[PDB]
């Protein structure tokens, strides 16, 4: 790895600088190097990893949707043949996206998840595993599509099972996991009723727990609760 010669602490420092400069590809490469040092990550370092790759893959997803839209229009009735270029370039972006997803899933498998014993780390990594299989599912069309979807579901489910046993209902990681698994149900699994039920039950159980929280914890939890209610508003 090109970051093998750089100190772990220097990689973390430069990831933070890259975030300040909105250089998310750099930030992801620095965090990849930090993970590959083989030590467990702290809470803050897990955030740096997830922010970096979320921004990289988010950009790729946005681009892929633009191109897929153009490609679909090109294949409608009455559209003038434009050649293979739209498909080729959509495929190029798609392959790069899959590569990023495979890289993140690789870090989780080698060896972040197997060393993550605390709920706060293990749930976070399993949620990420669900997220990056979900991104693969968004572009999947082949023999393995159902297996990709089930890989996302399995990771999310394991994360949910732990989060319900080991975290309070207002824990922001528990809330964010439920937010994203709900979107998985709605957008990937064709299960809108399950998406809505999960978002609503998650919201209501968090509401009932807010009274236990400090002002700062309250702010953190209500932020994610508002995203649950935003999705519910979109869907109902």
């Amino acid at each position: 790895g090109a970051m093998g010669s750089m100190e772990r602490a220097s990689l973390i420092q430069k990831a933070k600088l890259a975030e300040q400069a909105e250089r998310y590809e750099d930030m992801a490469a620095f965090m990849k190097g930090a993970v590959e040092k083989g030590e467990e990550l702290s809470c803050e370092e897990r955030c740096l990893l997830s922010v970096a790759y979320k921004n990289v893959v988010g950009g790729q997803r946005a681009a892929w949707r633009v191109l897929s839209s153009i490609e679909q229009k090109s294949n409608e009735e009455g559209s003038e043949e434009k050649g293979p270029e739209v498909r080729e370039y959509r495929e190029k972006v798609e392959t790069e996206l899959q590569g990023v997803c495979d890289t993140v899933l690789g870090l989780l498998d080698s060896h972040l998840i197997k060393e993550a014993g605390d709920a706060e780390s293990r749930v976070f990594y399993l949620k990420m595993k669900g997220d990056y299989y979900r991104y693969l599912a968004e572009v999947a069309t082949g023999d393995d599509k159902k297996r990709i979807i089930d890989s996302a579901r399995s990771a999310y489910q394991e994360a949910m099972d732990i989060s319900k046993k080991e975290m309070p209902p207002t824990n922001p990681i528990r809330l964010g996991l439920a937010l994203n698994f709900s979107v998985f149900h709605y957008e990937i699994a064709n299960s809108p009723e399950e998406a809505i039920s999960l978002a609503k039950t998650t919201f209501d159980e968090a509401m009932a727990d807010l009274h236990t929280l400090s002002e700062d914890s309250y702010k953190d939890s209500t932020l994610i609760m508002q995203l649950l209610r935003d999705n519910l508003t979109l869907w109902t």
């Binding site: 997220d131 964010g176 937010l179 994203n180 979107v183 957008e187 995203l227 935003d230 979109l234 869907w235």
Partner: peptide, 5 residues
């Protein structure tokens, strides 16, 4: 698109 974090 729906919100995810």
């Amino acid at each position: 698109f729906p919100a995810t974090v």
